[PDB]
């Protein structure tokens, strides 16, 4: 059997040289002042680092490496038809900084729930939405590099009921302060290439309309309300890539609220790959945010 998932997008989605990538991540993180430590969950983009790395630093700076010991990474599936969630078949996720080990105890528990399928190595390596969080996770945790594990989870095209079921499942881990949930998503993909041209002309320029649409969704997430987030998706069909991981996170949050826990979510940075001004333009939006639980 193969023990390691290769960093199959190193060199094309981020720098393949370990030292250079470490330096890039350090610069981005050094631009950010921590305000939401110790983050129990984060939302972070999964585009190429040239496009979204400085944005993603706003989420990853909120991780406290002396507290966090187990990092779940929930990323949407881009290439395979998947109606549930899937777990990796390997034991180690390689990165150019250092290699990350999967938490065997949690993987066994998750598998024993019976709600997960096993993703093949090819499916595992083909997807990028989890991989793009490995370098940043490795960088954020480096002061404790030998004392943490990861729990990779591929999230498919979940129904609403599956979002609720998986939220309930993951809530027991979300309530543990040693755990961190990384929820991978980009926001609005606007343009004819994405077959998405929603435009609110009360907002002015197209990029301002995109910013307004994205921030309506972001505010709804800050309301910790999965039903309202679902209604927002049904109303505008915003091209939020990781809407299913986000729905899982929101349902998990509502499970913890029904158990006495107090929580708050704040988005800390918003960016667009470019500023659309005409109908032939296209852009992708990135947003970084953090959930703290007391
Ligand atoms: N270099 C990689 C990544 C390129 C990239 O990051 N593109 C931007 C669009 S400007 C992006 O946001 N991709 C992820 C997405 O569309 O959600 C590739 O060739 O696909
Ligand atoms: Fe995407």
Numbering used by the authors: 4 to 297
What do the paper's sentences say?
Mediator of ERBB2-driven cell motility 1 (MEMO1) is an evolutionary conserved protein implicated in many biological processes; however, its primary molecular function remains unknown. MEMO1 is a highly conserved protein found in the cytosol of eukaryotic cells from yeast to humans. We conclude that MEMO1 is an iron-binding protein that modulates iron homeostasis in cancer cells. Our work reveals that the iron coordination mode in MEMO1 is very similar to that of iron-containing extradiol dioxygenases, which also display a similar structural fold.
To reveal the binding mode of each metal, we have crystallized MEMO1 in the presence of iron or copper under the conditions similar to those used previously for solving the structure of the metal-free protein. To prevent metal oxidation, MEMO1 crystallization with iron (II) or copper (I) was set up in an anaerobic chamber and the plates were incubated under argon, while the crystals were growing. In the MEMO1-Fe structure, iron density is clearly visible in the region of the previously predicted metal-binding site with an overall occupancy of 40–60%, as confirmed by the anomalous diffraction map. Iron is coordinated by H49, H81, and C244. Thus, iron coordination by two histidines and a cysteine in MEMO1 is an unusual variation on a common theme. A glutathione molecule was also found in the MEMO1-Fe structure, close to the iron-binding site, with the glutathione glycine carboxyl forming an electrostatic interaction with H192. This finding is consistent with Fe-GSH binding to MEMO1 observed by ITC. The protein fold of both metal-bound forms of MEMO1 is essentially identical to the metal-free structure, with RMSD for α-carbons of the superimposed structures being less than 0.17 Å. Inductively coupled plasma mass-spectrometry (ICP-MS) showed that, under these conditions, MEMO1 binds stoichiometric amounts of iron (approximately 1:1 molar ratio). The iron-binding site of MEMO1 is structurally very similar to that of iron-containing extradiol dioxygenases, with a notable difference of a cysteine residue (C244) located at the position occupied by a glutamate in those proteins.
